[PDB]
Structure 1
Amino acid sequence: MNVDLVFLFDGSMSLQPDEFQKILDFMKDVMKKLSNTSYQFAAVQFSTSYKTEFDFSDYVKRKDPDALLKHVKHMLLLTNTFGAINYVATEVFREELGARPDATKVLIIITDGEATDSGNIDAAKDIIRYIIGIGKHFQTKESQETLHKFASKPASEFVKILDTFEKLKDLFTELQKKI
């Protein structure tokens, strides 16, 4: 089961330091669970700009989530989600970076709010896309709906809403069962 999975995680100024750390720990939890499988991983932080923290070929070389994320620094700027998702589609899923032609493409987006930019994500639409929206900005059904445009269909499966960043641990507990 070859899966190329990318974490696209929010580094905007609205995240508290401990919240940003909980995202990193969540990504490590998932990668450790899937060590020695046919999964490959890449990770991109987005805020105003988009930084690839590691590509698939970095993961293949190291297979060490702690080492791969050791130097991540919280950008503390905007939340340009449209640009970020397009970036993943065109700049991360590439064979030259270790992506596999035969693999199933998965994108896991983690964010605390609405995009600050605009456009479309059509270039990424064939990727299986989950989005995890966390915190006070997604308490109403109306506010939760703003995330649907980024995720695969139906939203009932592919959009996860969490009350706090502490619930990422609980989400992992549930996800790990699906392995």
Structure 2
Amino acid sequence: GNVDLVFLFDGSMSLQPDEFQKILDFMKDVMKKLSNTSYQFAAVQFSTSYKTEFDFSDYVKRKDPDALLKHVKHMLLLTNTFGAINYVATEVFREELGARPDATKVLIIITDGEATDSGNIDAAKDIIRYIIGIGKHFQTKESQETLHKFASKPASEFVKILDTFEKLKDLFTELQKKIYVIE
């Protein structure tokens, strides 16, 4: 059926210009591949606070991915992941913002560091949540587990750990192998 997918990307102080660009490229690639499908998209940059770069209505109005993200500016601040996730659940997934009523909700969280805040993401528990942890900040198994709480279960399918930002290209390659025209 319909799929309303939200990209919640890390814009923290740790990211180098090229790394931030690779995150933007990844989001665009998936969007272009899935253009003219039953998917609709929204994008929110998060660091200390949260900013919807374009919401569902924006995408519907102008499907152009490159145009939708041409205005993004790297925040360069903290990594308040609990707040960011709750922000999507209540401020982005809204009918008035273009979200479709009984559409399946999906969240693709991309981050390069552990969350600097805490609390709960209970309000977002019914959204299908994928998280992509990139870079040396996720070298240890300990740091990787910290991401499970944000993603759906099992972690084996929903939590993806990438050692480099270059690997985002590999991940896109792999996701395309999972694309099918369903009966």
Q: TM-score, normalised by structure 1?
A: 0.98
Q: TM-score, normalised by structure 2?
A: 0.96
Q: Deviations over 1:37-91 (max 9, x none)?
A: 0100000000111000000000000000010000100000111101000000000
Q: Secondary structure of 2:147's partner?
A: helix
What is the count of residue pairs matched by the alignment?
Answer: 177
Identity of aligned residues (%): 100
Per-residue deviation, 1:117: 0.7
- Compute the RMSD of aligned alpha carbons: 0.5
Equivalent-residue separation in structure 2 for 1:12 and 1:82 (angstroms): 14
Q: Deviations over 1:94-145 (max 9, x none)?
A: 0000000121000000000100011100000010000000010111222210
Consecutive unaligned residues of structure 2, counting only runs of 5 or more, are 179-183
> Deviation above 2 Å: which 4+ runs of structure 1?
none
Consecutive unaligned residues of structure 1, counting only runs of 5 or more, are none
Equivalent-residue separation in structure 1 for 2:119 and 2:141 (angstroms): 23
Q: Secondary structure of 1:63's partner?
A: coil
Equivalent-residue separation in structure 1 for 2:19 and 2:149 (angstroms): 24
Q: Deviations over 1:4-33 (max 9, x none)?
A: 000000001011111100000000000000
Aligned residue for 2:89?
A: 89
Aligned residue for 2:162?
A: 162
Per-residue deviation, 1:177: 1.5
